[model samples]
Target: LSSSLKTCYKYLNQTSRSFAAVIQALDGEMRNAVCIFYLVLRALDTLEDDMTISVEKKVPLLHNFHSFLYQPDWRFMESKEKDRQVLEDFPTISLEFRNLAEKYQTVIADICRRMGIGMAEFLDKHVTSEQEWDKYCHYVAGLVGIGLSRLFSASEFEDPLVGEDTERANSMGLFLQKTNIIRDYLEDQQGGREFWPQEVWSRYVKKLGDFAKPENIDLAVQCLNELITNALHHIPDVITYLSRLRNQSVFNFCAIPQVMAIATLAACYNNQQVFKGAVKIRKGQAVTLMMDATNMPAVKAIIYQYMEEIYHRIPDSDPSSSKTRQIISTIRTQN
Candidate 1:
């Protein structure tokens, strides 16, 4: 790799380890376009998330961020201290974006524009319903899935998915976003940021943060399991989406995250650790999935394995137990 490409990958590594792994597994200019694509959005997400920056300033910056991606020397100085480098060295990504095929460049810019506007719209509101939550996740992540699908199509890896399968694409992003929201309940609460919709959490708890209390363990676990079940509903769509990918790198890129999301749901289900601290699949298990999730069958195997683990652990007393077992059975029968 050239020094410019090296800089992009280095920033990618620093920004997100799992994504860098999957992006590196990609081949050719497609790989370069995706690496730059991720960094551009990562920088934008940093801008949106930095609470230190006033909303008045952040909203305009987000709305016009795609324009900056086209500018050769554009950089922002408003991110949190930890995220400053991505903004500081952002020109490297712009240079790469400029070199991508016209179609890829166009898709990246358009997605950035849409996402910028979407992020700005929600800067002042809390997600009120499951519908609103889906819309929010669609803006933040589903667009990402669509953008990647378009890139894969532009690269001639999977042209049929160019404009089709958007519903599936949206589900792909929703699944991952829901899993993160479930796992990060306490972390987000501590940071004074809440992404889980009130419609879902209010069904059990009066306040979102109340789940963190030791006395709320049973209710919290119950809520956690129901959210996991909600996430599970997206698996059939994810399976359909992955079954259509043609490129090896694209397959790995799409498959690894979905497997990890299910694995994470399994870890958080009925496990009180999520409310107290971080809960994640063991690194050994993640490494195994990374190495093995190269095909549909292996990916299904991982999903089945995790679902079985979840199945055994579901308490008969939990309200979602029947729903959980039914979902697992459906997945088993479908696969």
Candidate 2:
């Protein structure tokens, strides 16, 4: 790797070492390609996630963030957010981004452009409708899925079919993103942000923050379970998506997180601890999955294992129990 590229990876490792490991495991230029793509988006996300900025100030930063890729001197040193270095060191990141091959550059730039626009559009909004939740997730994450598939396909290391199946790729991201939002109820709310659609949460509590109350613990898990069920609906799409990988590292790249999400979903499904605090898979369990999920069968088995766990926890009295069961059974028959 070149000097700036190494710095790019440094920024990635600083931001998320778990993601950093899988990224380096990628084959050939795809590693650099995916690495740079992640940093650019990571920089974008850092800006959006920072609540310290005024919408007026953050407006241009997020909305025009994609264009900043072409500019040589764009960097944000002022962020109070913990991961602000990605933005502060953006000149290094964008330098490496500009160094990518033209084809890869095109994919990264396009997604960054579109994602910047999407982030800006939702800057002052809250997710109120279920459909809007999907819309928001699509813009925030589905686009990353499509962009990654494009990079995977362009590298000639994976089938074009992996890239062409945009819908499934979209689901791959949605499953993970929605699971993150569900698992991060406290963190998101603590940050003065909310991603859960009010349409679903409002039925249980009068306000989004009401679920945080000790008195509302039952309603919180019920609503939480309902969201977990919503996240589970993306399973079959992910099954078919992971089932088609033709490369091992690529398969592992795709599979580890897919397995982790289902496991996390299962962990958070009926557990009221989610509303009370952060939920995560154990560190040893994560390493075990990273080592185990090297092939399709292992991935499917891991997925089924979690689905069954989730299946057992669906309370019959919960409003979403039937739909959750139906989704899991569908995943069973298909996977």
lDDT of each: 0.87, 0.88
lDDT of 1 by residue, 260-315 (tens): 89889988989899999999889998898788999999898888999999999999
- Please report how far candidate 2 places residue 318 from its true position, in Å: 1.5
Model 1 quality (TM-score): 0.95
The pairs that clash in candidate 1 are: none
Q: Can you give the lDDT of residue 265 in candidate 2?
A: 87
TM-score versus the correct structure, for each prediction = 0.95, 0.97
Task: State the displacement of the C-alpha of residue 97, model 2, in Å, after optimal TM-score superposition.
Answer: 0.9
